[PDB]
Amino acid sequence: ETGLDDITFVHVSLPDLALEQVDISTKIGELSSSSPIFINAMTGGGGKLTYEINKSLARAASQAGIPLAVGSQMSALKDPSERLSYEIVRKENPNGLIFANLGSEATAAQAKEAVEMIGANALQIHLNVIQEIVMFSGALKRIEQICSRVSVPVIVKEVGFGMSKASAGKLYEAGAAAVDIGGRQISFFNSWGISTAASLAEIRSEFPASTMIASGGLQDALDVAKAIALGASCTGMAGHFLKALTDSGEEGLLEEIQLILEELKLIMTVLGARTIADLQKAPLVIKGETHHWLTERGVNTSSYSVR
Amino acid sequence: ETGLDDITFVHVSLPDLALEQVDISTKIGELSSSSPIFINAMTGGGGKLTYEINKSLARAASQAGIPLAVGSQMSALKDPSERLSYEIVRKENPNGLIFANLGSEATAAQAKEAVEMIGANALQIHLNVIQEIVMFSGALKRIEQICSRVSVPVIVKEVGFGMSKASAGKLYEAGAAAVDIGGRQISFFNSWGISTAASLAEIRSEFPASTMIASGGLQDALDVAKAIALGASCTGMAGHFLKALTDSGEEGLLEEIQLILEELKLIMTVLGARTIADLQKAPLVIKGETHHWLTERGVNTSSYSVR
Amino acid sequence: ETGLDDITFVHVSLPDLALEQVDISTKIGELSSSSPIFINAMTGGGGKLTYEINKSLARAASQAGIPLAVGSQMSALKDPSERLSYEIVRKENPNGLIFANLGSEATAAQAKEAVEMIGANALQIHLNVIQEIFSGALKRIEQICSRVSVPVIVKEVGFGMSKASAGKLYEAGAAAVDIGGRQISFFNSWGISTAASLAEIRSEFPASTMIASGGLQDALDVAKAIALGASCTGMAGHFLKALTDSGEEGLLEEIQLILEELKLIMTVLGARTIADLQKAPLVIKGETHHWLTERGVNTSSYSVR
Amino acid sequence: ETGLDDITFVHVSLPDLALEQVDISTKIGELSSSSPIFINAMTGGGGKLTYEINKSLARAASQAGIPLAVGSQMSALKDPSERLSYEIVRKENPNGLIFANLGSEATAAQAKEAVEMIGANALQIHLNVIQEIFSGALKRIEQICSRVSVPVIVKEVGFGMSKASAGKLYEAGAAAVDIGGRQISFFNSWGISTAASLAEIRSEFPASTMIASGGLQDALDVAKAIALGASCTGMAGHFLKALTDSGEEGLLEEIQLILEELKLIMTVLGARTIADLQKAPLVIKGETHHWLTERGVNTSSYSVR
Amino acid sequence: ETGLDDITFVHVSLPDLALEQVDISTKIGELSSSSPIFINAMTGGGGKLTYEINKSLARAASQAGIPLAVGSQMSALKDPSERLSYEIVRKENPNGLIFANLGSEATAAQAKEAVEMIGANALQIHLNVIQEIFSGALKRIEQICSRVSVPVIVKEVGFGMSKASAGKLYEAGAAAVDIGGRQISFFNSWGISTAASLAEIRSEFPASTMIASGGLQDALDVAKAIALGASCTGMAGHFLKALTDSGEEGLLEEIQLILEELKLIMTVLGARTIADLQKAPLVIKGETHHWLTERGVNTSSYSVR
Amino acid sequence: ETGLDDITFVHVSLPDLALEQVDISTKIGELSSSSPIFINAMTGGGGKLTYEINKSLARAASQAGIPLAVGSQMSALKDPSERLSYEIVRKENPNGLIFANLGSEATAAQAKEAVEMIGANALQIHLNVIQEIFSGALKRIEQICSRVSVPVIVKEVGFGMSKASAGKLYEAGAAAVDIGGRQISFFNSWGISTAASLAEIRSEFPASTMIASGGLQDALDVAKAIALGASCTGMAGHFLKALTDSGEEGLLEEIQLILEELKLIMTVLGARTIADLQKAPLVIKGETHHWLTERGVNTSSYSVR
Ligand SMILES: Cc1cc2nc3c(=O)[nH]c(=O)nc-3n(C[C@H](O)[C@H](O)[C@H](O)COP(=O)(O)O)c2cc1C
Ligand SMILES: Cc1cc2nc3c(=O)[nH]c(=O)nc-3n(C[C@H](O)[C@H](O)[C@H](O)COP(=O)(O)O)c2cc1C
Ligand SMILES: Cc1cc2nc3c(=O)[nH]c(=O)nc-3n(C[C@H](O)[C@H](O)[C@H](O)COP(=O)(O)O)c2cc1C
Ligand SMILES: Cc1cc2nc3c(=O)[nH]c(=O)nc-3n(C[C@H](O)[C@H](O)[C@H](O)COP(=O)(O)O)c2cc1C
Ligand SMILES: Cc1cc2nc3c(=O)[nH]c(=O)nc-3n(C[C@H](O)[C@H](O)[C@H](O)COP(=O)(O)O)c2cc1C
Ligand SMILES: Cc1cc2nc3c(=O)[nH]c(=O)nc-3n(C[C@H](O)[C@H](O)[C@H](O)COP(=O)(O)O)c2cc1C
């Protein structure tokens, strides 16, 4: 439940645009991407299978010209053996944006080694206190240390429970180039968190010019569009691509990518949005739970409509 | 329906806390308690069984270091025989906080005798007009007389229908050290009352520094947390503990107590709340019926979110 | 669900009976009882709390005239202090029926020793090889029945009992059977309902003694269990609660209240005795009906009789 | 629920009949009636309000040609003033069928006296040993039938009636049976539906007179009751309401409206007479079907006939 | 609901057939048709709009090879101008099958005259004594069949038809029967479903011609109707709509689309001919199953064949 | 839905067995297998990703002792590079059972060549004439069985299989059948459930080998399929997922986990062998029950045995 169904674009009768004029390029921090959609690979079970799955993703990605994030490289950090499974990603995709990945427990050292491992353009640090607690002092400290010692932009990612404007503000201040929103005691967290939608609207209100990313739960192109309209500069997808891979291999995956990138252009065309920056100012109406949450949190919702 | 499901904590991505730093001690008036959870014993059927059930509760309590409230001592007041069933509680738990119990019909005399009976640290006076009417002049008068003649703090308890800021204000003014929120004509009261949640938020708005207690309906540790976040200094539980007792005796009960006290620490850890006073300022969002009720009643709801 | 909701008594317009002429006495195996209902004590958590709960259950029971079954005695078999928590049952109820209790793992020696501890009038052996996941179980039950003189009631817990299993227990020497009907997911719809078991077992052993315990919500459930073939019914949770909410005086009231409510239902049915209620015309529907039909158990006999 | 919704008439494409050729006259026991429907007065709360309601029901009834059954007369049997509230029924309706009314506790003397009070053409005796919670009931009914010359209709209230009970009442001498199908919780799903009773009783006594009252919502319900075996149907609440909302003229209209609507359904069915509607092909489904099946009552005969 | 959803074909793993070998030709009574489906024109509102709709339906029909049934001709029988709205049907479709149409009130003279108006190959007589609320109906149908040389198809509208009614129409001389299955409330659950009728009528008259019209949503519904016994199926609303949304070219497409979709279902079933599809193994469930069972119609023959 | 939810095992109170005495070995046709469960590889999208997935499935399989079926080989039959993606299966699993795979269109030469490619112990031929919309199919299957020496398992996909189709495949020489049960709308409720097929086919061919694949959610589903008659069960999606989420070590664990969970269910049932689990008393209800009943398949034998 990303809360994106609480967002409805305001219809444009005269979009005055041709699909061919639609520009979907975007900027993740200072990095330039020709796609507002990137692939979030899964760690997997390791071995030679993970290697082939990653190689395929990298090829597909390289061809579609869209970014690619690898799974956690922590294990490959201690086991020189498993390291090949990630280096193959940079070998297959030499000119594409690729993001490294490590948990918030990582040290500035490991972060550098992970980035160097695949020649990353950015480094993703994922947080997950609620999950690590069931199965946390120093997290922010560690992130702050990593940010000032890596040669690339850092993207702090929250897996599942969303992020507040306070959390985002701390990461930003600490040095994070961006944030990636993914929003017998497990019951305690059944209705816990902030929705992807609410998160974006919240963080956007306090930091208008700050890079936001949304990933997880984005079922289709309309989802991507809503997230980007709420402020996201880029969106990420995993499962969707993973399965298309195991069904039709590289050939299939590539198709699915192109298909959704074209389906986004279609939505932008119907909205009169010529570029991603235009899609970020598209009039829309927030309703339901999201609208309630934002209202109580002090976030203005009508500004999304009257703009 | 405590209305606590209308409360959702605002997620904290970087709680920056270790379970070991969590301090769950609290203050019920001037009384200090190492636990924000106390046991509300049930009167029972009397006899020697009630005696053993109370003795066990007292032992369990004494060991877990959490307060214990006995059932109404009114009957034991007129029958010198049944008195032993309560005195055993102080014998077994000599160093723990124990609250005496009497109905609002009690006199300053009986109140003193009840308190003296078990050497109570506080005295609970329960109100229940709607129940006593189906199966009330002077109630406040009697409470006011009891408060100025007992040597301990008085806790006025409402069983089931909640309490308004007006009701709380009168009891406070009368001398009550705290209030315990428990929110063929019976149909008249099917949808009658104020929810535990709404009550706390209401009373808290008019009396910020006044001791509030919440009991009844608190199914788990998250409930306790929400109540304490709404302003409660302490929460009470009965059924939950009563049954664990009859299932595994003292040994079992003790476990269940420790289990829920540790599960609360876990929630506080995920929230970044180092202490109970911190849990009382935890950003949260009120929705649904509770939010409506409070809005109409003039209580500010966004203050719980933006704080 | 016990399946008893699938049982509807055929209404009687002219019962021709007065509540005073109703006899609720029954017969568990060779044992006689003035009540078709009995308390099913719960082991609890040892300590003096059990001692007192047991003592109270024993007193009430004694005064009510209904038999009492104690919780498992495996612990008292080893601990002296705990043993007193059971001996008290007989000390307070010297003339009433009392059933001793042990698991199907118990040895004949243990069975005998448990019986002597409380001067039991019958012994309950509970099964549930399902939770214990073995071999010998049946043979161990057989010895127990041979070793003890008093009737042995083998109690199944929650999953029901088929005519085949009942028959095996009977051949082993059991005086009666007590019907209570990541891997745990496999047994979500596993079993035979209380109703289906009573009807099934009764079809193969019309004279054998059956008991129904667990789930029985009220007098009417008791009435149906007996109508379906049970000679006695057991109840725990209801009584336990009545004890912790009103003490002995409470329990004694609830025990009487339910016995009088049973006599009422029998009056409305024209059943003067427990043997009559066992021949009361009724109609079986829904799942129960299908199960019994596929299993070859006649269902119209309950209606045409 | 009467269970009549479980009855669906087999459609007739070529009825070959005109509304004018339809005969709705029937026969209650030895009594003849030009209507298969009759008013079922309600005792009310005595006083002059009953006197007037009765008088109105009597007038309407008289003008409509349909029989009228008065509420219980037990009070008039003792009070002179109240007695006039019933005598008026015959005073205003001197040539119509009228049924007297008493409880199953009534004595033969009372029965006879109630009949003479209004010059009754039949006597209703209502049962409900269920609410009275006895012995003798049946024997008391027997005497009543023997003591009174007019036919006695034993009316069951709400819980239905089995073939066994009906048979007992018939042996007792009843001319017909009127089917109306903290402890109160025991009887929430207790009983036999109106439909199930008619079908059951009819299976054992094909010539005996049965009546269906209570629940009948409209003409179609009347049609089904008769089709299932009833010789007459009773209605109260509907008429009572029609009286307090439009007076006599209203009641008289509603009475005619429903009688003409019955003739219509019969026309669409090709049933020229009441004896034909009683052999009308129909299909029994749902609960009714199961009940009858388990009770050994044939259901296909209603369809293949 | 037609009840066809209660019919599920038994799947065939190895049909052993090519869409090219499938033959959908059938036989309505003595009439031959290259299509098991036909258009059921709608009288409409006279005027030149009917003339044009009819003309279009006739053209499409003609080109598609499927028979066309015109709406009621009772008005043209009296009005010259309107008459042209039907004569045009034959003028535009000189070699195709066309059915004339009249109500069951029509007289043999009218029937004959309606047939001559369009040079009909068969005549439809629609029933619905239900809405007309008489006597003679059947006898009038008989004369009509005798007076006209072409086959007469008696069409029931919405309430279904029982084996008894069908049998009467057959004895009267009907070549086939067309199954279409404040007082209005009485007929809310009145009738026999299309499926139940076909199965019932077929059980008594295995060789007689039956038609199913109304409700058929698509090719699969057509497949089931035939499987259940129908020799032809009728469709209106679907075609009418196709005409007002795409004109003749549209209708002609929809007509072909559905015929090819039928051949597909037959291919998947291994039914090469219409006579094969009529012996296709299927399973009857739900209401239909019960109805047929209670009515004594065998249901397993549809499955074991 | 597989229909397996309509199957409930009859509970056994005294199984008399230890998990150690349970034997899950079975027999597919003439082939012997130490496991009643096998992996059902998925063709995927060629390339080195298939080569690796296959290699991993082969390794796991090999270590687990369970047979492996490869995806379609039609592509490898023509492409050399792809061929290696299958040859590797045997290279990594030299002593385990492996099934080759081809469509029902394949020619005997292709069948033989596919078998030699991986040194197959059996060959699977999948059907689905439904999606291919022909003639010869059966005759082509026959030749394939004759041309290849190893047993041929004809696999139906999603729509089930009737006793008739199974019988045809058996006469053709198939060693076993693998049950997997704008126009697309026609087949929304088309087919026979996995359960219904196994029961149906078993009724006509008590000794013939059947396999159940697809839908099986867990060990209990496996238990039921076998109980209903299957000699082996297939699983894909579950294993595939386990591979992409934990690699070989994961798959090997899930394979063992499910095999031990099967042995548990058998222990609770008292079934020591696979041949015993095939005679385990069970009750069939709902749709399955009706289908089998109408199709003339006995359902009580599953319960009374
Ligand atoms: C097997 C598995 C492995 C994953 N590994 C990683 C990881 O290494 N790093 C990370 O940041 N997220 C990881 N994720 C989370 C996903 O990237 C993402 O947050 C979401 O759960 C799945 O994306 P989707 O909703 O687009 O399918 C994993 C998810 C699964 C199911
Ligand atoms: C049998 C019984 C006896 C009780 N006796 C008392 C009492 O003496 N004094 C009191 O203040 N509340 C009494 N209560 C109320 C509980 O303390 C509390 O308000 C609530 O109903 C039960 O707590 P829970 O929701 O945590 O189980 C009693 C409740 C029950 C069921
Ligand atoms: C706390 C507790 C302890 C129990 N102990 C035993 C026991 O020692 N032996 C036994 O045969 N049944 C035992 N039972 C089962 C009950 O006697 C009975 O069969 C049923 O599961 C629960 O009560 P009911 O009959 O009111 O539903 C226990 C039940 C509970 C709740
Ligand atoms: C106010 C009132 C009084 C009634 N009094 C009698 C009575 O004296 N005797 C009797 O046999 N039935 C009596 N009935 C029952 C009705 O005649 C009838 O059987 C049924 O319960 C209610 O009307 P219905 O047939 O329209 O459903 C009474 C019903 C009502 C509502
Ligand atoms: C506007 C309209 C006029 C119709 N006129 C006739 C008619 O004259 N004669 C007749 O036998 N059926 C007539 N029908 C019935 C249809 O031919 C058919 O049996 C069915 O009720 C409606 O179409 P369907 O088969 O597509 O459901 C008419 C239906 C409609 C909607
Ligand atoms: C990606 C994919 C490829 C498959 N390829 C084949 C194949 O080549 N041959 C075959 O007989 N079945 C094939 N299947 C069917 C499966 O083996 C199996 O019968 C079922 O449809 C899906 O797995 P399940 O058994 O876990 O439900 C395939 C299924 C999937 C998802």
- With residue E122 as reference, give the H or E element that holds it: strand E122-127
Task: Choose the closest CB to F135 out of E8, E17, E261.
Answer: E17
Cβ proximity of F283 and F44 under 8 Å: no
Task: Choose the closest CB to A296 out of B21, B220, B305.
Answer: B305
Per DSSP, the three-state class of E85 is helix
C252 → chain B, closest CA residue: B45
Check contact D-C (3+ Cβ pairs < 8 Å): yes
- With residue A9 as reference, give the H or E element that holds it: strand A7-9
Residues in contact with C304: Cβ distance below 8 Å, sequence separation at least 6, in sequence order: C281, D295, D296
Q: What residues does D154 pair with on adjacent strands? A: D125, D177
Q: Could you tell me which residues of C are annotated as the binding site for Mg(2+)?
A: 132
Q: Which chains touch B (3 or more CB pairs under 8 A)?
A: A, C
- Cα separation, A99 vs B46, whole angstroms: 70
DSSP string, E91-110: HH-SSS-EEEEEETT--HHH
- With residue C9 as reference, give the H or E element that holds it: strand C7-9
Both tokens assigned to E302:
């549809």
Identify the sign of the CA torsion C254, C258, C261, C263: negative
Check CB contact of B88 with chain C, cutoff 8 Å.
no
Contact assignment for C191 to F11 by CB distance below 8 Å: yes
Residues in contact with D46: Cβ distance below 8 Å, sequence separation at least 6, in sequence order: D75, D82, D85
- Cα separation, B54 vs B69, whole angstroms: 10
Contact assignment for F299 to C294 by CB distance below 8 Å: yes
Place of tokens 């004896």: D275
Residues in contact with B58: Cβ distance below 8 Å, sequence separation at least 6, in sequence order: B68, B88, B89, B90, B91, B92, B93, B96, B98
F45 is in an annotated binding site: no
Rounded to 10°, the helix C137-147/C163-172 angle is: 40
Q: Which chains touch F (3 or more CB pairs under 8 A)?
A: A, C, E
Residues in contact with C293: Cβ distance below 8 Å, sequence separation at least 6, in sequence order: C299
Both tokens assigned to A75:
């294990």
Beta strands in C86-174 (DSSP E): 98-103, 122-127, 152-156
Q: Give burial (CB, 10 Å; 0-12/13-18/19+) of C195.
A: buried
Cβ proximity of F163 and F204 under 8 Å: yes
Nearest to F302 by CA among F9, F3, F5: F9
Q: Which atom of ligand 6 is nearest to the CA of F215?
A: 27
Cβ proximity of A288 and A6 under 8 Å: yes
- Cα separation, A126 vs E82, whole angstroms: 81
User: Which range marks the domain in which residue A48 is found?
Assistant: 1-307
- Cα separation, F199 vs E72, whole angstroms: 53
Residues in contact with B280: Cβ distance below 8 Å, sequence separation at least 6, in sequence order: B228, B229, B231, B233
- Cα(B145) to centroid of ligand 2, in Å? 25
Ligand index nearest the alpha carbon of residue B241: 2
Residue type, B37: I
Both tokens assigned to E256:
């072909």
Check CB contact of F240 with chain A, cutoff 8 Å.
yes
Residues in contact with C180: Cβ distance below 8 Å, sequence separation at least 6, in sequence order: C155, C156, C157, C158, C160, C194, C212, C213, C214, C215
Q: How far apart are the first and last CA of chain E?
A: 26
- Cα separation, F280 vs F227, whole angstroms: 6
Q: Could you say which DSSP state residue C207 is in?
A: T
Q: Which atom of ligand 5 is nearest to the CA of E44?
A: 1
Task: Choose the closest CB to C165 out of F13, F220, F265.
Answer: F13
Nearest to E154 by CA among E130, E129, E176: E176
- With residue E69 as reference, give the H or E element that holds it: strand E68-69
| Distance from the Cα of residue C167 to its chain's centroid | 18
Residues of C in contact with B250 (CB under 8 A): 45, 47, 49
Residue type, E184: I
Cβ proximity of D198 and D179 under 8 Å: yes
- Cα separation, F161 vs E10, whole angstroms: 9
Q: 3-state secondary structure string, B117-128?
A: HHCCCEEEEEEC
- Cα separation, F234 vs F118, whole angstroms: 19
Cβ proximity of C292 and C284 under 8 Å: yes
- Cα separation, A127 vs B51, whole angstroms: 52
- Cα separation, E55 vs E45, whole angstroms: 15
Rounded to 10°, the helix F194-204/F163-172 angle is: 60
Q: E114 CA to chain F: closest CA distance, Å?
A: 39
Both tokens assigned to E131:
């809405």
- Cα separation, C42 vs D101, whole angstroms: 56
Contact assignment for C159 to F14 by CB distance below 8 Å: no
Check CB contact of E297 with chain D, cutoff 8 Å.
no
Question: Number of helices and strands (H, E) in chain E?
Answer: 11, 12
Residue type, A111: A
Both tokens assigned to B46:
């009397």
Identify the sign of the CA torsion B72, B75, B79, B82: negative
Residues in contact with F20: Cβ distance below 8 Å, sequence separation at least 6, in sequence order: none
Both tokens assigned to C219:
């007098």
Place of tokens 């209203």: D250
Per DSSP, the three-state class of C217 is coil
- Cα(A64) to centroid of ligand 2, in Å? 66
Cα dihedral value D32, D33, D39, D45, nearest 10: -40
- Cα separation, D164 vs D200, whole angstroms: 9
Identify the sign of the CA torsion B195, B199, B200, B202: positive
Q: Which chains touch C (3 or more CB pairs under 8 A)?
A: B, D, F
Q: Give burial (CB, 10 Å; 0-12/13-18/19+) of E134.
A: middle
Nearest to C62 by CA among C96, C25, C100: C96
- Cα separation, E153 vs E175, whole angstroms: 6
Q: Which atom of ligand 5 is nearest to the CA of E213?
A: 25
Q: Give burial (CB, 10 Å; 0-12/13-18/19+) of D251.
A: buried
Identify the sign of the CA torsion A32, A38, A40, A41: negative
- Cα separation, A233 vs A218, whole angstroms: 14
The domain total for chain E is 1
- Cα(F124) to centroid of ligand 5, in Å? 52
Atom 2 in ligand 4: residue holding the nearest Cα: D42
Cβ proximity of E128 and E158 under 8 Å: yes
For C299, F195, F196, F221, the CA distances from F6, given in Å and listed in that order, are: 21, 8, 10, 11
> Which CATH number goes with the domain that contains F290?
3.20.20.70
- Cα separation, D143 vs D165, whole angstroms: 17
Q: What residues does D302 pair with on adjacent strands? A: none
Place of tokens 């009510």: C64
E132 → chain D, closest CA residue: D268
Question: Taking CA D212 as the corner, what is the angle to CA D211 and CA D218, rounded to the nearest 5 degrees?
Answer: 135
Cβ proximity of B67 and B35 under 8 Å: yes
| Distance from the Cα of residue E38 to its chain's centroid | 7
Ligand 5 pocket residue status of E181, Cβ below 6 Å: no
Nearest to C223 by CA among C63, C2, C30: C2
DSSP-derived pairing of the beta strands F152-156 and F122-127: parallel
For A48, A132, B33, C16, D134, the CA distances from C270, given in Å and listed in that order, are: 79, 66, 63, 6, 10
Cβ proximity of C253 and C292 under 8 Å: no
Q: Which atom of ligand 4 is nearest to the CA of D40?
A: 17
DSSP-derived pairing of the beta strands E232-235 and E37-40: parallel
Q: What residues does A122 pair with on adjacent strands? A: A99
Place of tokens 């608190």: B218
Nearest to B234 by CA among B20, B31, B4: B31
- Listed by number, the residues of chain A in 119-148 with a beta carbon closer than 8 Å to a beta carbon of chain B are 127, 129-130, 133, 136-140
- Cα separation, A273 vs A265, whole angstroms: 9
Residue type, B103: G
The phi and psi torsions of D284 (rounded to 5 degrees) equal -100, 130
Give which of B52, B92, B251 to mutate to test C binding, by max C Cβ within 10 Å.
B52
Per DSSP, the three-state class of B35 is coil
Residues of C in contact with F221 (CB under 8 A): none
Q: Could you say which DSSP state residue B275 is in?
A: B
Atom 14 in ligand 6: residue holding the nearest Cα: F42
- Cα separation, C95 vs C109, whole angstroms: 25
Q: Could you say which DSSP state residue C122 is in?
A: E
Ligand 6 pocket residue status of F241, Cβ below 6 Å: no
Place of tokens 């009706």: F290
Residues in contact with B168: Cβ distance below 8 Å, sequence separation at least 6, in sequence order: B179, B202, B203, B206, B207, B210
Q: Which atom of ligand 4 is nearest to the CA of D237?
A: 26
Contact assignment for E129 to D14 by CB distance below 8 Å: yes
For B301, E7, F3, F196, the CA distances from E10, given in Å and listed in that order, are: 63, 10, 16, 11
D261 → chain E, closest CA residue: E183
Q: Which atom of ligand 1 is nearest to the CA of A182?
A: 19
The count of other CB atoms within 10 Å of the CB of residue E244 is 12
Per DSSP, the three-state class of A51 is helix
- Cα separation, A39 vs A98, whole angstroms: 9
Check CB contact of C65 with chain B, cutoff 8 Å.
no
Cβ proximity of C161 and C196 under 8 Å: no
Cβ proximity of D152 and C184 under 8 Å: no
Q: What residues does C123 pair with on adjacent strands? A: C100, C152
For A139, B223, F69, F122, the CA distances from F119, given in Å and listed in that order, are: 56, 63, 12, 9
Q: C188 CA to chain D: closest CA distance, Å?
A: 28
Ligand index nearest the alpha carbon of residue F156: 6
Cβ proximity of B125 and B73 under 8 Å: no
Q: Residue B18 region, left (φ>0) first, then alpha (ψ -120 to 50), else beta?
A: beta
Using only the alpha carbons of chain F, give its radius of gyration: 19
Per DSSP, the three-state class of E33 is strand
Q: 3-state secondary structure string, E47-58?
A: HHHHHHHHHHHH
Q: Please tell me the experimental approach by which this structure was elucidated.
A: X-ray
DSSP-derived pairing of the beta strands B37-40 and B234-237: parallel
Q: C232 CA to chain D: closest CA distance, Å?
A: 20
Ligand index nearest the alpha carbon of residue B244: 3
| Own/partner long-range contacts of F132-136 (Cβ < 8 Å, ≥24 apart) | F132/F105, F133/E19, F133/E264, F133/E267, F133/E268, F134/E16, F134/E17, F134/E18, F135/E16, F135/E17, F135/E18, F135/E21, F136/E16
Cβ proximity of B201 and B162 under 8 Å: no
Beta strands in chain B (DSSP E): 7-9, 26-28, 31-33, 37-40, 68-69, 98-103, 122-127, 154-158, 178-181, 212-215, 234-237, 284-286
- Cα separation, A269 vs D135, whole angstroms: 88
Identify the sign of the CA torsion A75, A76, A78, A79: positive
Ligand 5 pocket residue status of E128, Cβ below 6 Å: no
- Cα separation, A75 vs A55, whole angstroms: 18
Instruction: Resolution in Å, one decimal, please.
Output: 2.8
Beta strands in B144-228 (DSSP E): 154-158, 178-181, 212-215
